[PDB]
């Protein structure tokens, strides 16, 4: 048989068969419903629209994200998303395919318990497993040591791993992610004169952020340059024409990652959290961690992020140390690649959670050695 690797993530579900080079199906994890009445008779539109389909009918629907920050809030729509992924995008019955899932660090145990219960009862998969995103990301890069920073759309976490031995006491989780950056961009664009309120226009703002934003190596100098020069302004085309222009907001939005105080968060920037996490570890493994800093997640795709991160860490770390940041081109798909590699290992075949083992041990078995 073959194993199935699915990554719910947050804001982007990516699924495929184990052993493949890239995920087969990638689509937003969005469930939408029609807020209007509808007058045509015989159209027979269905109640809910899931996945990329709901994107095409954005103007008529209202969208809801089942995942806020890693955790799942609404379960019925999550079940709908899983069913759509299994039956429509992959067109494979899950009755004979082990499923590997990715789960962020430091989340409620009830999340895993309900996930496994739903997967074992609703779909009756023969077996399934849950793994941490950071470990899979490290698998994909081919490394075995080094601190990995995974910054998705829901949560950003640093997990230091040395010689394949994780250090749980040094794991650091921060709720700042891509969704908060999009919200801050929505809030800041009002200054120029553009107002976005409808959940549909959240997607337009997200597209603007993806295709236009960039990270500045130095902040005050860039502000001074923008205050005088006009070489930074760029124009974007909305779906219905009405071109808009954007200047400072081009690079102010990502700076929230390094300056959480913009959005009122008390915590420090991601660079400072990474340095603190490295220091929280022992003293004999800091060399490799400094020299094997790994980045992953969609939010990390900002151009120029690596240079700023390296500059900040070098400013923090001792000068004698060498700081290197690994930024593969396929950052956002690193987790799924790592999961595919892990599911294809021969030694992993005995670490699945079997059906009858699940039944006799109960839903809590997920928290035993079969982590």
């Amino acid at each position: 048989t073959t194993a199935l690797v699915c990554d719910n993530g947050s804001g982007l579900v990516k699924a495929g068969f184990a052993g493949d080079d890239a995920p087969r199906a990638v689509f937003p994890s969005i469930v939408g419903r029609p807020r209007h009445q509808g007058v045509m008779v015989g159209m027979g539109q269905k109640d809910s629209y899931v996945g990329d389909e709901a994107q095409s009918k954005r103007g008529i629907l209202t969208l809801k994200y089942p995942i806020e920050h890693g955790i799942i809030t609404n379960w019925d729509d999550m079940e709908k998303i899983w069913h759509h992924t299994f039956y429509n995008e992959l067109r494979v019955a899950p009755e004979e395919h082990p499923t590997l899932l990715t789960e962020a660090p430091l989340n409620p145990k009830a999340n895993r318990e309900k996930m496994t219960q739903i997967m074992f009862e609703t779909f009756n998969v023969p077996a399934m497993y849950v793994a941490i995103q950071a470990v899979l990301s490290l698998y994909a890069s081919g490394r075995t040591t080094g601190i990995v920073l995974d910054s998705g759309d829901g949560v950003t976490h640093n997990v230091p791993i040395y010689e394949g031995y994780a250090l749980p006491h040094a794991i650091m989780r921060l709720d700042l992610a891509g969704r908060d950056l999009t919200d801050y961009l929505m809030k800041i664009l009002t200054e120029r004169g553009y107002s976005f309120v409808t959940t549909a226009e959240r997607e337009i703002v997200r597209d603007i952020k993806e295709k236009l934003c960039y990270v500045a190596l130095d902040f005050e100098n860039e502000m001074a340059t923008a205050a005088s020069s006009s070489s930074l302004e760029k124009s974007y085309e909305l779906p219905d024409g009405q071109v808009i222009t954007i200047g400072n907001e081009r690079f102010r939005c990502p700076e929230t990652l390094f300056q959480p105080s913009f959005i009122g968060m008390e915590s420090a920037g991601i660079h400072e959290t990474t340095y603190n996490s490295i220091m929280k570890c022992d003293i004999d493994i800091r060399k490799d961690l400094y020299a094997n800093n790994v980045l992953s997640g969609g939010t990390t795709m900002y151009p120029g992020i690596a240079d700023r991160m390296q500059k900040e860490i070098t400013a923090l770390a001792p000068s004698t140390m060498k700081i290197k940041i690994i930024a593969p081109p396929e950052r956002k798909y690193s987790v799924w690649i790592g999961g595919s590699i892990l599911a294809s290992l021969s030694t992993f075949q005995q670490m699945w959670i079997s059906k009858q083992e699940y039944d006799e041990a109960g839903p809590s078995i997920v928290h035993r050695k079969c982590f």
Partner: protein
Amino acid sequence: SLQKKLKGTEDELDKYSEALKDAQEKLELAEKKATDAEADVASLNRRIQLVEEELDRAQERLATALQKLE
């Protein structure tokens, strides 16, 4: 009598529209390539400056080492 003129005008409009659409598509391609190249060159220019500072301080403490060895 004017039917042939209208047909010719429609054909010319279609040809011009197709040429224009090709012009855009190609312009977007070129602009995307130019933006990517500009970003890459700027990033490696920043790398150039940081490695230049590294090299400068390298000669600095190398000279310090030189006299202390003297």
